[PDB]
Structure formats: structure tokens, C-alpha cells
Amino acid sequence: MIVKPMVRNNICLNAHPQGCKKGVEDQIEYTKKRITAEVKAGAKAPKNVLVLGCSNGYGLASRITAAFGYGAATIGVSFEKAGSETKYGTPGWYNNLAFDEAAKREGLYSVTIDGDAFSDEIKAQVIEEAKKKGIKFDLIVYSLASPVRTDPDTGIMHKSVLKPFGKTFTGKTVDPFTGELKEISAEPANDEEAAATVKVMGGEDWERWIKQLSKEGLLEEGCITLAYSYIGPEATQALYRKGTIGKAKEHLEATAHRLNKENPSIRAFVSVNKGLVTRASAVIPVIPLYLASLFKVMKEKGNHEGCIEQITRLYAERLYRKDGTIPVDEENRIRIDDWELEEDVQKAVSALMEKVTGENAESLTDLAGYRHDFLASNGFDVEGINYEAEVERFDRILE
Numbered sequence: 001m002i003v004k005p006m007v008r009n010n011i012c013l014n015a016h017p018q019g020c021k022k023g024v025e026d027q028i029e030y031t032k033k034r035i036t037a038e039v040k041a042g043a044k045a046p047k048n049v050l051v052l053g054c055s056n057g058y059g060l061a062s063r064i065t066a067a068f069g070y071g072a073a074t075i076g077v078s079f080e081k082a083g084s085e086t087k088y089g090t091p092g093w094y095n096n097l098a099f100d101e102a103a104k105r106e107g108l109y110s111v112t113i114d115g116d117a118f119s120d121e122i123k124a125q126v127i128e129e130a131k132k133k134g135i136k137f138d139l140i141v142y143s144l145a146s147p148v149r150t151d152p153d154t155g156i157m158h159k160s161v162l163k164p165f166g167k168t169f170t171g172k173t174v175d176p177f178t179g180e181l182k183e184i185s186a187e188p189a190n191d192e193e194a195a196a197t198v199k200v201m202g203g204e205d206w207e208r209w210i211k212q213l214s215k216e217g218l219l220e221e222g223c224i225t226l227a228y229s230y231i232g233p234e235a236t237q238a239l240y241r242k243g244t245i246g247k248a249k250e251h252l253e254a255t256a257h258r259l260n261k262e263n264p265s266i267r268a269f270v271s272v273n274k275g276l277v278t279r280a281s282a283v284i285p286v287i288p289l290y291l292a293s294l295f296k297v298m299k300e301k302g303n304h305e306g307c308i309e310q311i312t313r314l315y316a317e318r319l320y321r322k323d324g325t326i327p328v329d330e331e332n333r334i335r336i337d338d339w340e341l342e343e344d345v346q347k348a349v350s351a352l353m354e355k356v357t358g359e360n361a362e363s364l365t366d367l368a369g370y371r372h373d374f375l376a377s378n379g380f381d382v383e384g385i386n387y388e389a390e391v392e393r394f395d396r397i398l399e
């Protein structure tokens, strides 16, 4: 069967098994080139690391660099739907198969607990798994992006929204394939939707993960733990600062202080990373247009870093650096979005967005790069993969 992109309502349904595998392998070679001994030595290294949300995006790079850069044991946890012989799985199900295969070849320990990380059953599965192998955790990476969360105590399912407060946030959006420059808007969120997004996107659950692992004595002396976040440009402040994602973000970094205060033997940070193309982007205003214009500028300047290039820098120049310290900002946060929000980039992206219209879209913003990122998340448009070739089965990767 010829597997090619079936993208409906700007969301990609299928996934290319070999393309997912090559993706993880390309991210692996990069890690090996970037984390050399001139960078890895003179500083500590992670020995054992739990990665919550391991299967793609920032999760996958965090886990890749940890095992292939710093030769670490890794326990992943993600929510994936497996393949049949004939039924395509979620991109993550293939990415995790690809991660185990290449980590067996190099003789590293890796187990990926498949299932809902918000649940208690999963927390249990890793509690027993870390105990079964003995050694305890020195890096917990909270990297969960999910639109929904079943509460373990109440049992209520919580949807999340991406909306502003007070007045409608309206602005341009750009369909990356057609190049059509449209006009979508996010409408003010009420009070039921506001607390529901803090219930989901905040640090409510991340706190649970740390408390439970602490009473089980599964954390080392001075263990680093970090949750990912995003601040963004001055344009999307109405969603990311004073919006409903904004409030949820503020709860996450409030959890990072509450965690250092209640257990001084652990060190918690929220890492603010760069913006990149995800499943949310399409139906959220001025994010595709921003990101497409952003790649054009950052490619031109040579400070465009994708997922793996971002996280390798993080480990090497924030956590495990010669000096020992963890460089943070004013409100005690790791800053990796430092290149994105540097002003000569921001001023340039703003100029570019004002002079894009119904036809110059492909022409003066990087829609092609945006397409590649959006497709590569599903195993498509990866170089070195011939897509015309038939696909044997959907429940295994091979080569």
C-alpha cells in the first residue's frame, strides 16, 4: 500500500512507519555529533531519567539526547494507539519502537510504559519498574501536551481551550499547503473553561508525579525535574500571557516553586522553549503565520533550531554544564527561547507579517519549511525515504 499524507481539516490522520523510524535515527545522529566529549565531560551526566511524554516533539528529543548523548538509562511514558497489520498507529507508536531498537543495539536500558500518564495505574507501572531495576531517578522530564485529562481523584474528564479573556482575539491564519491567507478568531472563555484548562495544561499532575516518586524513595540527591512551557511573541500575548493558555502556564511555574519549597533535595524548573509546529497550531490565530514568518527569518539568520537542536543545547548549556550551575532568568525559569525572542529577530518577523497577503504567502514566508515540520511529525516528507514504495504491515518497523 502506498502510504501518503491524508491531511483533513489541517490535521494528519495516517503515519509513515519507516519515515518515523528515519526521523528518530536522524535525531540520533545529530545528538552524537553535537554532544561530544569536549561537552559531555567536566560536568555531570544523567544516569537514570524518566521522560513523561516520550513519544514525540520535545519529549522525544529529551529522551534521545539523554540516551545517545549522555549514555543514560531511560524510562518513557506516552499514550499511543498501536498498529495492526492493516491499521496505521499514531506516529508516536512508531517513534517508540524506533527508540527501543536503536537503544538495544547500543546496549542501553530502555522501557516505554504505554498508557495514560494522568492515571494512577501508570504511575504504579513505573514505580514498580524503577524498583525492579533498582537505581532511582536523577532527571524527570514532564513533557505532556494533551487536550484532555481524566482526574484521578474526582473522575471528571476535563477538556481544554485555547481562548482569551474579556475580548475576542482575532487575526490572520495561513493554511500551509494551499497558502490561503484567512481570518480565524478565538472567542472569550468563560469560567468553566478557564479552570478546566488549568486542570489539564497546568502543573497539577506534574506535582503528583514528583510527590509519589519521592515517598517511594525513587529520586537521587539534587534531582533535576523540568516541565516545558512557551511564552511567545508580543502578538499572541492575548492567548499566552493574559489568555486561557496563559493562566494554565502561570499555574505550571507556580508549581515549580511549590516543589522546591516542599522538598529542598530536588531542583524543579519550567523550561521555556522555542515555538514549533504542533497539532494545536492550525486552529489557533496568528500562530501559523507567525511560525511561517519566523522560520524564514531564523533560517536567514542561522539560528533556527528544531526539536533535537533545541534540547541538545538545553542539556549541554543549561543542565549538565562544566560550571555546574543552571542559568535561569528573573522568575527562575530555564530560557531556551532566548534566540527566538531576541529583538532583531522579533522586529524582523513583525515586519514580515504586516506585508504578507493573499498571494505572496508562499513567496515571502517559509510555508515549505512549515509543511516539512508538520509532515515530518507523522513520518512524511523525510529525506532519504522513497514514498512511492509499498508498505508491508503497520505493526512493525524494519531495517
Ligand SMILES: NC(=O)c1ccc[n+]([C@@H]2O[C@H](COP(=O)([O-])OP(=O)(O)OC[C@H]3O[C@@H](n4cnc5c(N)ncnc54)[C@H](O)[C@@H]3O)[C@@H](O)[C@H]2O)c1
Binding pocket: 052, 053, 054, 055, 056, 057, 058, 059, 060, 077, 078, 079, 080, 092, 115, 116, 117, 118, 142, 143, 144, 145, 146, 148, 228, 229, 230, 272, 273, 274, 275, 276, 277, 278, 279
Ligand atoms: N510547540 C509549542 O508551542 C511549545 C513550545 C515550547 C514548549 N511546549 C510545551 O512542551 C510540552 C510538550 O510538547 P511536545 O512538543 O512534546 O508536544 P507533542 O504533541 O509533540 O507530544 C506530547 C507528548 O504527550 C504524549 N501523550 C499525549 N497525552 C498523553 C497522556 N494523556 N498520557 C501519556 N502520554 C500522552 C504524547 O505521546 C507525546 O509524547 C507541552 O506541555 C507544551 O506546552 C510547547
